[PDB]
Amino acid sequence: SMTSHSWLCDGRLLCLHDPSNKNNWKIFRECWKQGQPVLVSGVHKKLKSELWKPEAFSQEFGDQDVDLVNCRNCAIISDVKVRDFWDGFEIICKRLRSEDGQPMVLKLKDWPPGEDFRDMMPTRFEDLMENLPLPEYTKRDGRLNLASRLPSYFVRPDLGPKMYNAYGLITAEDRRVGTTNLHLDVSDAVNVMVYVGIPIGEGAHDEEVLKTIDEGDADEVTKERIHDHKEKPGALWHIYAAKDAEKIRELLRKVGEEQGQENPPDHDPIHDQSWYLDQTLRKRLYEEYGVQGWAIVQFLGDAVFIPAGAPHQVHNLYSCIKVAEDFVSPEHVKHCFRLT
Ligand SMILES: Fc1ccc(CNCc2ccccc2)cc1
Ligand SMILES: [Cl-]
Ligand SMILES: [Cl-]
Ligand SMILES: [Cl-]
Ligand SMILES: [Cl-]
Ligand SMILES: [Mn+2]
């Protein structure tokens, strides 16, 4: 039967079911005040599905010049047409190949560039912004979004939203690689999965995706969304409380030293955005430092709420289109203050 919400991560993660409900804030606000992430399902059912297809982005914008990243080795592929990314999103035999002859796993960098989403894509901007959950927090003019109301003593977010486009990771070796490495933001954010592409060519790739979710520490209810309801899983997240950020820096300074990096004792491995916590490192963080995170599978139409200051990483299971908006809630404004 239909319900307002459920508890994931064995009780530690709120999942809201009705993205537009006017009373969602009554359930959300205490979890948010405690510094927890929140998941909201069902946003895809509110959107115009024809605006969020890979083939439309290629047809409309394909002659723009862009840079890509090879997710396996961090190599930059400079100054290529954006159709060269989009046309291989779901069709493996169209993908750019590495020198070994394999199809690459690619991430589209900074596209649309800087703050240009609204100017380049006005109909997509309207469709996203009118359907964001918790609109008093997330809309540019929301009553609980302080972004437009703070003086220069606070770091203010850029004008959004921002699009995040990347292929899925495929192989056993790929399990230890990030799509987006461990980092933190000084603003809050909402990240919406607007499209999931499950390919054809090397099409029959189900088994390595189940092993990735299981070794990723996903809970038993999360496993039921696949097996029972056949929803499309897009990306595996790990998120850590803002209060645990320095203990994570201590672990990564120790591992950098073990691997023969030569780093000053104060250097910031989270700001460097150079690490992905694999199963080995996640277990060492728990056992050696006492730190537990949230392992979250973001399915089509899921919105992930990321608290300001919370370290987080993303690993795509299939090809993903995500759209994110930054905001400044009163609950977490301390994280963007420029003093003490
Ligand atoms: F405060 C609230 C009271 C009720 C709700 C649930 N509304 C019905 C519904 C359930 C699931 C998906 C879509 C619609 C949500 C919040
Ligand atoms: Cl906080
Ligand atoms: Cl548009
Ligand atoms: Cl709200
Ligand atoms: Cl990254
Ligand atoms: Mn982020």
Curated annotation (Swiss-Prot):
Tissue: Ubiquitous. Highly expressed in placenta, skeletal muscle, kidney, heart and liver.
Domain JmjC stretches: 121-340
Subcellular locations according to the entry: Nucleus
UniProt binding sites for Fe cation: 183, 185, 312
Family from the record: Belongs to the JHDM2 histone demethylase family.
Disorder association: Diets-Jongmans syndrome: An autosomal dominant disorder characterized by varying degrees of intellectual disability, developmental delay, short stature, and characteristic facial features such as a wide mouth, a pointed chin, long ears and a low columella.
Domain notes: Leu-Xaa-Xaa-Leu-Leu (LXXLL) motifs are known to mediate the association with nuclear receptors.
Function: Histone demethylase that specifically demethylates 'Lys-9' of histone H3, thereby playing a central role in histone code. Demethylation of Lys residue generates formaldehyde and succinate. May have tumor suppressor activity.
More about this protein: Its gene is located in the 5q region of the genome which is deleted in del(5q) interstitial deletion, a frequent deletion found in myeloid leukemias and myelodysplasias, suggesting that it may be a good candidate for the del(5q) tumor suppressor gene.
The protein's name: Lysine-specific demethylase 3B
Top-level taxonomy: Eukaryota, Metazoa, Chordata, Craniata, Vertebrata
Shown stretch of the complete protein: 1380 to 1717 of 1761
